Amino acid sequence: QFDTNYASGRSGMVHLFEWKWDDIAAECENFLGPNGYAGVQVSPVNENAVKDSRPWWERYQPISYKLETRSGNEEQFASMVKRCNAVGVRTYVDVVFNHMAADGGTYGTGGSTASPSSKSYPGVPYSSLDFNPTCAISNYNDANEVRNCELVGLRDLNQGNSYVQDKVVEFLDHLIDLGVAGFRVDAAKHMWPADLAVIYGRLKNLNTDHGFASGSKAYIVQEVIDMGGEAISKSEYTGLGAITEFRHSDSIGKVFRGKDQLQYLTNWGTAWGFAASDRSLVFVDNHDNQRGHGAGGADVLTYKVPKQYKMASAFMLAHPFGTPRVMSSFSFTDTDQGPPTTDGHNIASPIFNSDNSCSGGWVCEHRWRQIYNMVAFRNAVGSDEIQNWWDNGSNQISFSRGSRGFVAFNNDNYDLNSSLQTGLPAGTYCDVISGSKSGSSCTGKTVTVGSDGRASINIGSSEDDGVLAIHVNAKL
Ligand SMILES: [Cl-]
Ligand SMILES: [Sr+2]
Ligand SMILES: [Sr+2]
Question: Can you tell me which residues bind chloride?
Answer without folding.
Answer: 184, 286, 325
